[PDB]
Amino acid sequence: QDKCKKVYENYPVSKCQLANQCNYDCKLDKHARSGECFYDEKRNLQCICDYCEY
């Protein structure tokens, strides 16, 4: 019921067109629960690592 998402303060912005690369990554690269490549009304994706996942 609180903050559980955090951008991977280290990752090459690329390879990201399926809930896997960033996903599986966070799911292990940062002992996370799940992740994904989220944009930002600018056209730039980022490896967002979710630990709680709603």
From Swiss-Prot:
Please give an example of a GO cellular component term from this record: extracellular region
| InterPro entries named in the record | Scorpion_toxin-like_sf (IPR036574)
Q: Lineage from the top down? A: Eukaryota, Viridiplantae, Streptophyta, Embryophyta, Tracheophyta
| Free-text function comment from the UniProt entry | Taste-modifying protein; sweet-tasting. It is 2000 sweeter than sucrose on a molar basis.
- UniProt-annotated location(s): Secreted
**Disulfide-bonded cysteines:** 4-52, 16-37, 22-47, 26-49
What family does the database annotate? Belongs to the DEFL family.
- What name does this protein carry? Defensin-like protein
Q: Does the keyword Oxidoreductase apply?
A: no
Q: Does the keyword Secreted apply?
A: yes
Gene Ontology biological-process annotations: defense response to bacterium; defense response to fungus; killing of cells of another organism
Keywords, in A-Z order: Antibiotic, Antimicrobial, Disulfide bond, Fungicide, Pyrrolidone carboxylic acid, Secreted, Taste-modifying protein
What binding partners and quaternary form does the record give?
Monomer.
